[PDB]
Design a protein around this ligand. Structure first.
Ligand SMILES: Cn1c(N[C@H]2CC[C@H](O)CC2)nc2c1c(=O)n(Cc1ccc(Cl)c(Cl)c1)c(=O)n2C
Ligand SMILES: Cn1c(N[C@H]2CC[C@H](O)CC2)nc2c1c(=O)n(Cc1ccc(Cl)c(Cl)c1)c(=O)n2C
Ligand SMILES: Nc1ncnc(O)c1NC(=O)Nc1ccc(C(=O)N[C@@H](CCC(=O)O)C(=O)O)cc1
Ligand SMILES: Nc1ncnc(O)c1NC(=O)Nc1ccc(C(=O)N[C@@H](CCC(=O)O)C(=O)O)cc1
Lengths: 283, 284
């Protein structure tokens, strides 16, 4: 029987560590950290997730607002709002929720956020710093996947990792961290492209000590694809239920570890954003 | 037996394209592109490599200077020199040949090159732009390996690529390009760590349609690790008094479907792609 890692529990604990770090920072006579989340449009999933982010900001003692704007906002307007927020000394953390509308260039928006306030780590210089190990802020989801592995004590040195990426933005940062020298990880890493058929993907996943699915494909990962005792992290959201890319009940029989959906990586993602926000608040 | 890709000949057409581009660009009455390369110390390999680069610049119509500073230069004086060049409007391309002396932090030096002049793409902003598909300029050796593959017409989409990196600096940018969406080849990519047993690597390379070795250990790649018709691309540079790659050239030439020699393989491609980055930089 595979042991199930409660992401929700591990993330709740991380918030408590952040909680106490914020109260110490404030008791020592500094300003309360403030996180701003910009929400454009009415994607219901984006609302759900941004709600989760401000909930957690409240739990850990961080002041938060979600500035919601209509989907018809122009790129020039969104840039002026980010400029306002960049220049407000009360705002320490600033993230724009994605995806944005087609008439806004996502690259230009993320690059407009101050790198000091970029609690998603999506500004191009914070991407470079992460590739080059000059960072102080990691993107929240890849960092959350690392914390699962690390806090669980799943060994990584030399081991084989396979990541099944829906995009480069989604799987490469996970691989980035898990491949880097000792957050190191010192692993051989495979990043699967969504144009590799599942038949070939199985050829890689069976060699893997850790399989991390980030493909957004229900039942992409099943027991035949996994080796005995391997660790399986599920990063996919797939929608009247919400499930991951793993066949949970199937691979629960042969995996060594597994994360559930919901209650796995998603809480960890929100947790790591709190760590980034207090980091930003200390300059 | 295996087709042997000539890096010399591939680079030759790439260089011919750059000469045409440069002359049409000068024909419109623009400043002739200029490249400055800073050479610290007396590493013989490094002087050889910088010379190759200045030769290529001359023959493609790009003016060039190599500024040789002694190893005992201080990090401060090197940063002053980089600052002068960043500000000189005649200088379009600036690169610092690596490695540097132990007393200088290569990371601060590389972030001191203006990102507009950074024809190696080693500045932290340009590393991010390449990660994020936002770049003007790609690191020469990864781009060179890509052009080998793409100009030889080796299929990549959904195929299995294995990269054997000596360091993350080396194999990650190569993997990054081949894993990207269509440069960018839509491929599955494995990046072996230097901390990898040869037989564990074997378990991945056997499955590989493209093995790219950049580990700097000779005979790392032998035929027993390739599958028939796979493409093997040798990025290593080893001494054994002879210069050789990471593959067993003779043995893999039977099983492989494609193979690159060393020398005359990836090396000349690296020099060629740096000319492309230079005309790009000049155009802003
Ligand atoms: C824009 N973006 C996203 N957005 C979308 C949000 C909507 C979802 O449905 C799919 C992901 N997720 C990112 C990044 C990002 O920029 N980075 C930075 C980064 C770091 C290293 C490297 Cl190598 C690279 Cl390529 C990129 C990340 O790490 N993650 C997870
Ligand atoms: C410093 N450096 C070096 N040094 C070489 C190491 C081998 C020595 O024998 C000669 C000096 N090679 C680099 C970089 C670099 O910074 N970048 C930028 C980059 C882009 C994407 C990603 Cl993901 C990453 Cl990690 C890094 C590269 O692409 N290459 C090939
Ligand atoms: N798009 C973005 N733009 C900017 N920065 C970002 O990080 C993102 N990406 C996310 O924010 N990703 C994310 C995914 C899931 C949750 C989450 O709360 N998951 C829960 C419940 C799911 C549910 O109940 O619907 C679970 O799985 O347990 C939170 C954030
Ligand atoms: N260190 C660096 N610092 C800053 N930016 C860089 O890009 C590098 N790296 C290189 O510049 N790498 C490089 C390696 C080999 C050649 C080359 O010409 N190889 C020939 C002849 C072999 C020989 O004469 O030794 C061949 O293999 O055919 C050219 C460039």
């Amino acid at each position: 029987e595979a042991v199930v890692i409660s992401g929700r529990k591990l993330a709740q604990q991380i918030k408590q560590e952040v909680r106490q770090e914020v109260e110490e920072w404030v008791a020592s006579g500094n300003k309360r950290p403030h996180l701003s989340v910009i929400l454009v449009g009415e994607n219901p999933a984006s609302h759900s997730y941004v709600l989760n982010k401000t909930r957690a900001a409240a739990v850990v003692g961080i002041n938060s607002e979600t500035i919601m704007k209509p989907a018809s906002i122009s790129e020039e307007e969104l840039l002026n709002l980010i400029n306002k927020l960049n220049n407000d000394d009360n705002v320490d953390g600033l993230l724009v929720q994605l995806p944005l509308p087609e008439h806004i260039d996502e690259r230009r928006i993320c690059n407009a956020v101050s790198p000091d306030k970029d609690v998603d780590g999506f500004h191009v210089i914070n991407v470079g710093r992460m590739c080059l190990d000059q960072y102080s802020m990691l993107p929240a989801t890849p960092w959350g996947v690392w914390e699962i592995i690390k806090r669980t004590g799943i060994p990584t040195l030399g081991k084989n990792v396979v990541v099944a990426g829906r995009s480069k933005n989604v799987g490469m940062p996970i691989a980035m961290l898990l491949h880097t020298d000792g957050p190191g990880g010192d692993a051989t890493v495979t990043i699967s492209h969504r144009y590799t058929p599942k038949e070939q993907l199985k050829k890689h996943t069976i060699l893997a000590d850790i399989v991390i699915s980030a493909a957004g494909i229900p039942n992409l990962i099943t027991a035949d694809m996994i080796k005995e005792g391997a660790a399986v992290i599920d990063v996919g959201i797939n929608r009247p239920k919400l499930v991951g890319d793993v066949d949970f009940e199937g691979v629960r029989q042969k995996a060594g570890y597994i994360t559930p959906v919901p209650g796995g990586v998603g809480p960890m993602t929100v947790a790591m954003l709190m760590k980034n926000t207090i980091i930003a608040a200390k300059k």
